[model samples]
Target: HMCDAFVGTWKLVSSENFDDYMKEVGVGFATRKVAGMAKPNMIISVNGDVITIKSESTFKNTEISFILGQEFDEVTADDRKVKSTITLDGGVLVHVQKWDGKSTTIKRKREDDKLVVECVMKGVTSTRVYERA
Candidate 1:
């Protein structure tokens, strides 16, 4: 019900507050410098209560498979192990990770015809925008 609008591939367009957010999240300077150059794309597929999100790029490609409301173990981009869970509320897809040593939250939702990702770490917040590709 909540994922019908986002079951497809999306191309990266522009991101806002990413640098600051990454910095707060402790990304290295060199990696941060070229983050946007990759122009990553996301492929999302939903089958009943299971969801898969694939992050594709020339740099690296990784896929995450999870079931809604079920907790799964995962390692984050910055090398932190976490317990992750995803849920949908009022048309918003929320992915939250439990980090004993890290703190971050990501919210994915649709804005008109675009998909938007809101990333937060510590007290910094960032937004990444995508359009149907």
Candidate 2:
């Protein structure tokens, strides 16, 4: 599977403009404060046709599992109940979620020794880098 390269534990190395990204997504200041202070690790796994991305942090943990191109109900780390879909495009994992007439796209791309997570909401964009753990 193309997801094989992503199947591993990744530790957050750096995050850029994540606070503004959360604000654009409607996350409150307090929640964003705590969330911002915590470093998260991602565990990605594949079982059959299902792919799971589990994010672990001291402040919160979130897990989402879905098949490629299938829509699924998801409760985001910020507690937004949204419909989400994940697809692979040119070796990049494109994850999209929509709710309340708004949407966000999260792209996870494997680049050499790191995984780059790009989160986009409205006009705000945040980039987070993770290294294999």
Candidate 3:
């Protein structure tokens, strides 16, 4: 059977130390507070060569699209404000985001019934693992 576990819309219920994670990424206090309170919506759709993931919140909306194994640019309008190119590393998704002359890689995966997303900046890493909503 195929893993259809990730084929739906998920709303952010709660996150672990997400504020600290945002701080590490240089997100300011006010923005982090807004982000912390906002419940972002994540929608994932996989079809043929196109795989799309959209994160929408009261602060901003971000939509990322790319073909399997191909790299493409992602625009973020709102919180966590930054632009980036997302690529697939083998089976995992990797994002190289640009912020203040620095760049970070965000790795994402869907394991079992949860979606595990992580970011690495200056050798320090943080993660936010999510469950289905």
Candidate 4:
């Protein structure tokens, strides 16, 4: 599977502009403050054609499991219940979540030995780089 490239344990190496991205997602001040300070490890796995992604952090943890190209109802880390879909686009993992006519696209691509994740909402973009743990 193309998603094989993304299946691993990756720790956050760097992050940029994530606070603004969460703000755009309607996260309040206090939560954003805490979230911005916490670095999470991403654990991705596949079992029987279903993919699972887990974000583990001291502040909060979130996990989602789904088959590729299918839409699912997801309660995000920010506690927003949204319609989400994940698909593989030429080795890139593209995840889109929508609610209240607003949407965000999170793209995860393996670059060299690092996993680069870009979160996009409206015109704001946040970049998070992770390396194998």
Candidate 5:
């Protein structure tokens, strides 16, 4: 019930395999190109059973809010509608989503003030690192 470790502003520092992940998610070439050039800022906050992520980028800005472990409809970064859930197994936050009947699992962990998230879909995986700002 005490989930405030990642409740801070962060910025992207590194990205690996993101291009492949975007391709699998049906992102257009132009959008992917611009996305790759962005160093988006993310604001994460957890209060009680609620979690919110406010994303800031030159291309687009959006805010997402959800309840932990509760099923909710979500529109992905690439604009795919999916059912999403977030579960916390200690310090690691697991995100499981299903779209078009296919499921994806993403894992996020915080270590030494850095937040890393691993995104996997269709066997392709992307690792993203965010540093506190």
Candidate 6:
């Protein structure tokens, strides 16, 4: 049943607030330029309380894992560290990340045939929509 909810792999087709989100995250200009141009692929696997999500691209790869509804320390391979938490809100998976002394919430949901991931930080918001491939 957990797999049924999240098993398929997805590739990011488009992203909103790309520049602002990167800037807010303190990504370097050169890196942000490349990140804006590259598309990212994400894979999700869930088993009971354990859940894993991998986001990959030509520029970088990030994998995050934790128990559902629990807060944990997550350090990305890229050297960024965050305190992360994943919870279900209204059947939608929500990830709250505390990074660089700021907090952002990413809400994920499946709509129609697409997976919609929305990130909101302060007044900046971004959305990444993916279709199963």
How much lDDT does each candidate structure score?
A: 0.84, 0.95, 0.70, 0.93, 0.86, 0.81
> What would the TM-scores of all predictions be?
0.90, 0.98, 0.75, 0.97, 0.91, 0.90
Q: Let me know the TM-score candidate 4 reaches against the reference structure.
A: 0.97
Order candidates by lDDT, high to low: 2, 4, 5, 1, 6, 3
Task: Give the Cα-based TM-score of candidate 5 against the true structure.
Answer: 0.91
How well does model 1 score by local distance difference test? 0.84
**Highest TM-score: which candidate?**
2
Error of 6 at 89 (Å): 0.4
Per-residue accuracy of model 6 over 1-133 as CA lDDT, tens digit each: 6436556799888888967976776678887787788788889988777888998888778888888788999875345688989987777899898876788788989888889988787788889899896
Model 4, position 115, has a per-residue lDDT of 99
lDDT digits (tens) for residues 1-133 of candidate 4: 6588889999999999999999888999998999898889999999888999999998889999999899999998878999999999988889999999999999999999999999999999999999999
User: Candidate 2: which stretches are off by over 4 Å?
Assistant: none
- Model 5 residue pairs with clashes: none
Q: How many backbone clashes does candidate 3 have?
A: 0
For candidate 1, the clash count comes to: 0
Clash total of candidate 6: 0
Predicted structure 3, TM vs. truth: 0.75
Worst 10 residues of 5 by lDDT: 1-10
Model 1 stretches astray by more than 4 angstroms: none
Candidate whose lDDT is highest: 2
lDDT of 2: 0.95
lDDT of 5 by residue, 72-133 (tens): 88887667798998888987889898987788888888888899989898889999999998
lDDT of 6: 0.81
